[PDB]
């Protein structure tokens, strides 16, 4: 049961009388119970990487052998909780200890056993009914916004023998009991899952559905999909807060899991200060997003094992909520800092340094982590679909995408949103660069757009072409000036200016377009690209005539239409209905048509 | 408390470098403290670097020279290194290991604290908010420091970073629009510079607020290791218990990193990047992140690590990991130093990430952010024009270029250049900034809103 | 078709045996069942990294950039299980796919695979960005067995000359592109403009191809000649006159 400390050096401890110990199993070394992980075995010895400070650990100290590897404790109580990378509840530690520090070797249960939860069994279940892994045997009224579906652990099954009646219970109560091959398993409302073991699913379905954000540049030009894999440059003035806040508040994601994974102290305190105060509208009422968000937050002086395990704990919570048929946006704030924690652990283990110092397995670990995302046909009996969408940000030194973490991230992700401090300074909010950014999910979303927004795909292609054309013309204008351009190129420049200023740019702080419904986005782009087509037609069909039309004539005649296109931003879905917004954009199209027709 | 008699061993089994291996030890603690008497009666302290079975690898603070088997005695104190802390150690000088070197008495402890401390709970850490004025315009007006920020000074070898540090220690304080304190901790500081700090603070009378730790370059490197942890344990005591805003100035984290390298190699660990230990990130973070405001306690801890970048390579592990762990940078510039501008704080690459929280209405003044942005923009344009001036020649420049060059000259002469004993409140630094920005007419102050120009530009 | 799958989430050490399972099956089919087998080994980079992990755990001598010292031998044990045999009608054609890390052909994986294998078909980001498909960069591409797979009899007798001259003209076109960025268009001679036109039309017509388009070798060679006709005979210095006077005029 207990081993005994036999030696100590830094975090490494050597414990004797650990004959039955299992590799990578967790132990509580010392009288203070510093958590440690068995990294090597020999005879009856066990070598332990102790996550916490070993000062004071002495030979002969007990080493309690916890029968599990590093595992997240899943159940009611996650929503709104703030966890360390080792699942320690930071808010509960602070409340219970009345101390500004994490006590050394603290051992607070991750999910409170004190608090009672309202539990309603799956009405169909009976004594003797056949039940399997992933099956929902009850629902817990955890929050007004989230119903928590109590599921049998994967790798569990049998015939129900006792299922509790509806009522109030707690994480320590045996709520179900099942029997298989005479072996009887008694299940509470909590299941413990190794963080590095992929939670099973009946099938990992293709990711054919958008992950909305309400930011036009993100939704239209660079779409992500429920179950996607995305990257974000992390820098000072870039403004990753825009993406994080928009995903937390407006995304169609049912749940949000945010993983600090080794942040600066105050940079993490900012997140913990902001997220509780963010709010969302559900059923016409304003609710805090902490009713649907869970934070794995830890700073840079927290144990290195916590920083490395932060990503895995976050993705395992996200997988658990995916298994209930929810869509879970998991945002890792610095996979670069997770990778530095990985390199630090590798160096402490004295492993051979691979490319640029990072371990031999950084790429494999990033691949096996990002692979855990995706839309899935969930395990268990009630037919469900969930998803985990990983938005893992990465921090390239000074924009250098070459370092191993960034290179593997951009080779393993399928979207890259490429925020840009230069655009931030130019006041282009969001700061998405719309040249380095990309999204490889465009093909997968043809099936969806061709059904619900049939006209959006060519529209998007033309918008991207216009932006690329201005990117080309910017070089010419340097050499020979603006006036040298053909009228077609003037149309390109001015329509691109219109798009950049009044379509991609977006005043998120204001009520009218903080959230831009996709019908509004597609209508905006439809009107603008209709203007492009009409101006191009007018110039092209009259370049050969005596009455040659020019962008100057177009600007002077249709100043009203240009102003209305630029003002299209101001339509507010909360004051203008969807129908009214669509009707107004159709009216703008008709008026543009009339003006171009009268000119032509 | 330990009511238990201590055990003294003569069972020295080896002496290998700075390590005395003892055997037959009864239940050794890792990082226990040990007082060993040499054959001749000299006494040396030490720390149990490693433990295995009944063996104990006692790293002696002083050298092992003179230690022998069969006659050295070695008393195991039975506890890890705990530093005594009080308010009385505000206004004192201590060597790296807490022993007073100001010919005063040993600290009469209000409490005993483990120097390793515990990490501050992220859910209890509060965003830093207000400003800590340093008296140096090049940072108060352009890179100001928020209460709770960790903002290192990056300087090369031979630049006056120690002089800047002494000035900050003499002048720093709250903006005052008696609960302030400074913990100065020199690591690996040569005798001349240590004597300079000791004499400077005593003379210019800041000592009533300064707790000064000095680890001379010839003091043990293990004492260098425990110097910043004494400094920050005292800072935590004064800030989060005595409730006062503490500024911790850790001088020469490059020297601290060399001491860390020495101790790592003594453990016989294979080197990492550029020779430093692989865990230097976590160690530097354990030092730095003992900072920031906390929930419900008025006190706070602000840090100004000082780095001697070897070879001036910003990619060197020390400055690189410090940039990852801290929240800004204050560059000290060789070109300015040679030009004899003091303080030679190059404002262009220096950055303070939380300056936007440090400054503003009710903290420094309404116009601080605008003046800062405008001064930076004008300085950048001035450098650009000064480059263009050698290409096109002065007679070909426009009048705007002449205004920018005049601003550059007066900015480096009046705003940056300060003199070591000229203390400027942030209000005075801002008034100087406005005197400089009045070189231009309003229309070229394009980064200051009219709302602010109309109010502050005149006079 | 026979598929062996070892996904990113599957065990790392098992990627060491997956190629060997696939090639054992291919050898059963080719050298015992006399099938003509095409073997594809996807992400030999994710194989070499598994090999690196095992060698680092064993603490074996490293080669360059951490990989084991015997990676050449191991990748040879994999690749060399290809080719025909005497008296057996089967064959094994391998097309390993490996991701150059940081697009660097000198990285140990691509370097050793180039030493071991009989060529490399080079896929170029600088073409993928321009949206050319297939973005093959013939210039660093190579095929050691072309020298006998082409000629009179099999395929056509202008195949080698056309290939060599296309390579030469493409290289000179890249040189002209490189120099025009320095000197500009106004300082180029008409020969350099010929080379630039050849490069443009070569990437447009020869390389660029439909993902479902199957050009016979004869169509491809006719395109090659349509491109080489951009030049006068005297600038096609590789092709002998016996071939120029026969295929050039048409």
């Amino acid at each position: 049961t207990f081993g005994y400390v036999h030696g100590v050096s830094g975090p490494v401890v050597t414990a004797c009388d650990m004959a039955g110990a299992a590799m990578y199993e967790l132990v509580r070394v010392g009288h203070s119970e510093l958590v440690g992980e068995i990294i090597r075995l020999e005879g009856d010895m066990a070598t332990i990487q102790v996550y916490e400070e070993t000062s004071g650990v002495s030979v002969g100290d007990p080493v309690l052998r916890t029968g599990k590897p590093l595992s997240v404790e899943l159940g009611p109580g996650i929503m709104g909780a703030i966890f360390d990378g080792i699942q320690r509840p930071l808010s509960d530690i602070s409340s219970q200890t009345q101390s500004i520090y994490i006590p050394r070797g603290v051992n607070v249960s991750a999910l409170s056993r004190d608090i009672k939860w309202e539990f309603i069994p799956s009405k169909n279940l009976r004594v003797g009914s056949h039940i399997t892994g992933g099956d929902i045997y009850g629902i817990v009224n955890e929050n007004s916004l989230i119903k928590h579906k109590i599921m049998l652990p994967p790798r569990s099954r049998g015939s129900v023998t006792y299922i509790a009646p509806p009522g109030n219970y707690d994480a320590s109560d045996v709520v179900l009991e099942l029997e298989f091959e005479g072996v009887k398993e008694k299940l509470s409302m909590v299941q413990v899952w190794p963080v590095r073991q992929v939670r099973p699913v009946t099938e990992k379905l293709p990711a054919n559905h958008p992950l909305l954000t309400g930011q036009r540049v993100l939704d239209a030009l660079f779409p992500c999909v429920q179950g996607g894999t995305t990257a974000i440059p992390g820098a000072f003035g870039c403004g990753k807060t825009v993406i994080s806040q928009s995903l937390s508040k407006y995304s169609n994601s049912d749940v949000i899991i945010y993983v600090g994974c080794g942040e600066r102290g105050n940079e993490m305190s900012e997140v913990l200060r902001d997220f509780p105060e963010l709010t969302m509208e559900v059923d016409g009422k304003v609710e805090s997003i902490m009713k649907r968000t869970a934070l794995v937050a830890n700073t840079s002086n927290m144990p290195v094992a916590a920083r490395e395990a932060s990503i895995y704990t976050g993705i395992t919570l996200s997988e658990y909520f995916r298994d209930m048929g929810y869509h879970v946006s998991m945002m890792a704030d610095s996979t670069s800092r997770w990778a530095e924690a990985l390199r630090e652990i590798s160096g402490r283990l004295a492993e051979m340094p691979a490319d640029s110092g990072y371990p031999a397995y950084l790429g494999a670990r990033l691949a096996s982590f990002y692979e855990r995302a995706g839309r899935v046909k969930c395990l268990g009996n009630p037919e469900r679909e969930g998803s985990v969408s990983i938005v893992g940000a990465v921090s390239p030194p000074g924009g250098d995408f070459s370092d191993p973490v960034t290179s593997a991230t951009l080779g393993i992700v399928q979207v890259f949103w490429g925020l840009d401090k230069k655009l931030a300074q130019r006041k282009h909010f969001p700061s998405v660069n719309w040249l380095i950014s990309y999204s490889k999910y465009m093909r997968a979303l043809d099936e969806y757009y061709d059904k619900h927004f049939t006209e959006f795909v060519p529209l998007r292609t033309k918008a991207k072409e216009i932006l690329q054309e201005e990117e080309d013309l910017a070089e010419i204008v340097q050499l020979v000036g603006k006036a040298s351009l053909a009228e077609t190129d003037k149309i390109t420049l001015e329509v691109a200016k219109l798009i950049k200023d009044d379509f991609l740019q977006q005043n998120g702080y204001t009520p009218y377009d903080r959230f831009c419904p996709f019908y509004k986005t597609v209508g905006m782009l439809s009107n603008m690209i209709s203007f492009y087509d009409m101006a191009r037609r007018a110039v092209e069909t009259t370049a050969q005539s005596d009455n040659k039309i020019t962008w100057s004539i177009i600007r002077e005649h249709m100043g009203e239409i240009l102003y209305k296109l630029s003002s299209m931003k101001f339509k507010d879905p909360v004051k203008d209905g969807e129908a009214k917004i669509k009707a107004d954009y159709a009216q703008l199209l008709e008026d543009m048509q009339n003006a171009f027709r009268s000119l032509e | 408390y330990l009511s238990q008699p201590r055990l003294t061993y003569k069972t020295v089994s080896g002496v290998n470098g700075p390590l005395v291996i003892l055997d037959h030890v009864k239940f050794p603690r890792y990082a226990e403290i040990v007082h060993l008497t040499l054959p001749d009666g000299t006494k040396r302290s030490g720390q149990v670097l490693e433990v295995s079975g009944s063996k104990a690898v006692v790293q002696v603070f002083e050298g092992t020279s003179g230690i022998d088997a069969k006659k050295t005695s070695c008393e195991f104190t039975g506890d890890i290194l705990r530093t005594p802390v009080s308010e009385d150690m505000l206004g004192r000088v201590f060597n790296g290991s807490g022993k007073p070197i100001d010919r005063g008495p040993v600290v009469l402890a209000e409490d005993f604290l483990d120097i390793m401390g515990q990490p501050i709970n992220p859910q209890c850490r509060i965003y830093p908010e207000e400003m800590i004025q340093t008296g140096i315009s090049a940072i108060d007006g352009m890179n100001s420091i928020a209460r709770g920020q960790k903002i290192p000074i990056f300087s090369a070898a031979g630049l006056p970073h120690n002089e800047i540090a002494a000035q900050i220690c003499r002048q720093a304080g709250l903006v005052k629009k008696e609960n302030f304190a400074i913990v100065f901790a020199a690591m690996g500081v040569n005798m001349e510079t240590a004597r300079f700090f000791k004499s400077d603070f005593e003379e210019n009378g800041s000592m009533d607020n300064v707790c000064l730790f000095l680890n001379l370059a010839n003091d043990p490197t293990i004492e260098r290791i425990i110097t910043p942890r004494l400094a920050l344990t005292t800072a935590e005591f004064l800030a989060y218990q005595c409730e006062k805003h503490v500024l911790v100035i850790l001088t020469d984290m490059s020297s601290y990193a060399e001491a860390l390298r020495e101790v790592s190699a003594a453990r016989e660990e294979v080197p990492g990047r550029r020779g430093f230990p692989g865990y230097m990130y976590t160690d530097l973070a354990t030092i730095y992140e003992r900072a920031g405001r906390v929930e419900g306690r008025n006190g706070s801890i602000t840090q100004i690590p000082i780095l001697t970048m070897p070879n001036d390579d910003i990619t060197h592990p020390i400055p690189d990991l410090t940039g990852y762990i801290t929240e800004g940078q204050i560059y000290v510039d060789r070109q300015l130093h040679n030009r004899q501008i003091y303080p030679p704080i190059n404002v262009l690459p220096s950055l303070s990430r939380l300056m936007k929280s440090a400054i503003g209405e009710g903290m420094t003044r309404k116009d601080h952010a605008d003046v800062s942005n405008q001064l930076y923009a004008c300085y950048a344009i001035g450098k650009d024009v000064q480059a263009m001036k050698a290409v096109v020649g002065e007679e070909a420049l426009t009048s705007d270029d002449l205004l920018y060059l005049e601003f550059l000259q007066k900015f480096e002469k009046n705003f940056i250049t300060q003199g070591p004993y000229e203390n400027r409140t942030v209000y005075e630094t801002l008034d100087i900034g406005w005197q400089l920005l009045r070189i231009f007419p309003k229309e070229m102050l394009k980064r200051i809103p009219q709302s602010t120009l109309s109010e502050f530009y005149p006079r | 078709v026979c598929l062996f799958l070892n996904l990113a989430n599957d065990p790392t050490i098992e990627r060491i045996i997956t190629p060997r399972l696939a090639l054992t099956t291919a050898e059963f089919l080719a050298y015992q069942c006399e099938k003509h087998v095409l073997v594809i080994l996807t992400d030999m980079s994710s194989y070499a990294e598994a090999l690196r992990e095992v060698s680092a755990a064993r603490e074996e001598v490293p080669g360059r950039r951490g990989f084991p010292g015997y990676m050449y031998t191991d990748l040879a044990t994999i690749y060399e299980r290809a080719g025909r045999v005497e008296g057996r009608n089967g064959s094994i054609t391998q097309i390993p796919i490996l991701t150059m890390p940081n697009d660097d052909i000198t990285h140990p994986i691509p370097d050793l695979t180039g030493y071991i294998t009989e060529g490399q078909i080079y896929v170029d980001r600088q073409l993928h960005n321009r949206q050319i498909y297939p973005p093959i960069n013939v210039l660093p591409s190579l095929s050691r067995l072309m020298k006998s797979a082409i000629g009179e009899g099999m395929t056509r007798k202008d195949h080698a000359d056309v290939s060599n001259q296309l390579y030469a003209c493409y290289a000179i076109g890249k040189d002209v592109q490189a120099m025009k960025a320095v000197v500009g268009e106004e300082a180029l001679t008409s020969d350099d403009l010929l080379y630039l036109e050849f490069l443009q039309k070569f990437e447009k017509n020869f390389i660029t191809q439909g993902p479902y388009e199957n050009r016979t070798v004869y169509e491809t060679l006719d395109i090659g000649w349509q491109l080489l006709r951009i030049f006068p005979k005297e600038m096609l210095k590789r092709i002998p006159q016996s071939t120029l006077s026969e295929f050039y005029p048409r």
Binding site: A350, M352, P353 | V270, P271 | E59, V61
Partner: peptide
């Protein structure tokens, strides 16, 4: 690093052989 790792391995082996 590899040389020093090998050397430490061999020192460990010698220490074991000393017993």
């Amino acid at each position: 690093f590899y040389r020093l790792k090998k050397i430490q391995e061999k020192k460990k082996i010698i220490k074991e052989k000393s017993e």
